[PDB]
Assembly symmetry: none
Amino acid sequence: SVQIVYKPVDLSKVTSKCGSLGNIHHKPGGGQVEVKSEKLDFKDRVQSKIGSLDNITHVPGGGNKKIETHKLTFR
Amino acid sequence: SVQIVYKPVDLSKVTSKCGSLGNIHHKPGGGQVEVKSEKLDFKDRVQSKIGSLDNITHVPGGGNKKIETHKLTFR
Amino acid sequence: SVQIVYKPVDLSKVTSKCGSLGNIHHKPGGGQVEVKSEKLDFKDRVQSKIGSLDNITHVPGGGNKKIETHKLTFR
Amino acid sequence: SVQIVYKPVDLSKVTSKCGSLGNIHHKPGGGQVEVKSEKLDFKDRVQSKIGSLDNITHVPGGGNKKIETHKLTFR
Amino acid sequence: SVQIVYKPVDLSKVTSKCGSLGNIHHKPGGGQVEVKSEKLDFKDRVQSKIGSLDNITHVPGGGNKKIETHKLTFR
Amino acid sequence: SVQIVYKPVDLSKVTSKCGSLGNIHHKPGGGQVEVKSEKLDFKDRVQSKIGSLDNITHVPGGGNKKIETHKLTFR
C-alpha cells in the first residue's frame, strides 16, 4: 500500500552586512499648496486629501525576508 | 495501508549586521497649505483631511522576517 | 490502516546586530495650515481632520519577526 | 673618574577598546545675536568676534596619549 | 676620565580598537547675526570676525598620539 | 678623556583599528548675517571676515601621530 515521506532539509541563510547606513533625508511637500473653490456641487460621496500625507521613510538595518510554504495533500 | 511522515528540518538563519544606522531626517509638510472654499453644497458623506497626516518614520535596527507555513491535509 | 506522524524540527534563527541607531528626526506639519470656509451646506455625515495627525516615529532596536503556522487536518 | 649610564626600559601600553561610539549631537547654533554700537572710540588695537566661532566636535575612536621626556644634563 | 652612555629602550604601544563610530551631528549654524555700527573711530589695527567661523568636526578613527623627547646636554 | 654614546632604541607602535566610521553631518551654514556700518574711521590696518569661513570637517580613518625629538649638544 502507500508510504509517503516528507523530509525537506533547509540549512539556508539570508544575510546582510552594512558598515554605516545614514544621512537619509526625505522632504515631501516642501512647496506651497493652495486650493480655492467657488460654487461646487456634489450629489454623492466626497473624499479629499490636501497636504503631506502617508509619506514614509523606512530604513531597516536589515530588511531581509524568507518565506517558505510546505504543503502535503492527500485524497 | 497508509503511512505518512512529515519531518521537515529547518536550520535556516535570517540575519543582519549594521555598524551605525542614523542621521535620518523626515520633514513632511514643510510648506504652507491654504484651503479657501465658498458656496459648496454636499448631499452625501464627506471625508476631509488637510495638513500633515499619517507620515511614518520606521527605522528598525533589524527588520528581518521569516514566515513559514506547514500544512498536512488528508481526506 | 492509517498512521500519520508530524515531526517538523525548527532550529532557525532570526537575528539583528546594530552598533548605534540614532539621530532620527521626524518633523511632520512644520508648515502653516489655513482653512477658510463660507456658505457650505452638508446633508449627510462629515468627518474632518486638520493639522498634524497620526504621524509615527517607530524605531525598534530589533524589529524582527517570525511567523509559523502548522495545520494537520483529517477527514 | 666619572661613569654614567642611562638605560631606562619602557614596555608600557596605553590602550582602549570600545564597541560602539555614536549618536552624538552638538548644537552651538540657532542663536540670535544683535550688536548695536554708537559713538565708540578706540586708541589701541581691537579684536572682535561675533557669532558661532571655534566650536568643536571631536570624536576620536581612540584618543589615547603618551608623553615621555628624557633629559640628561651635565656641567 | 668621562664615559657617558644613553641607551633608553622603548617598546611602548599606544593603541585603540573601536567597532563602529558614527551618527555624529554638529550644527554651529542657523544663526541670525546683526551688527549695526555708527560713528566709530579706530587709531590702531582692528581685526573682526562675524558669522560662522573656525568650527570643526574632527572624527579620527584612531586619534592616538605619542610624544617623546630625548636630550643629552654637556658643558 | 671623553667618550659619549647615544644608542636609544625604539620599537614603539601607535596604532588604531576601527570597523566602520560614518554618518557624519556638519552644518556651519543656513545663517543670516547682516552688517550695517556708517561713519567709521580707521587709521591703522584692518582685517575683516564676514560669513562662513574656515570651517573644517576632518575625518581621518587613522589620524595617529608620533613625534620624536633627539638632541645631543656639546660645548
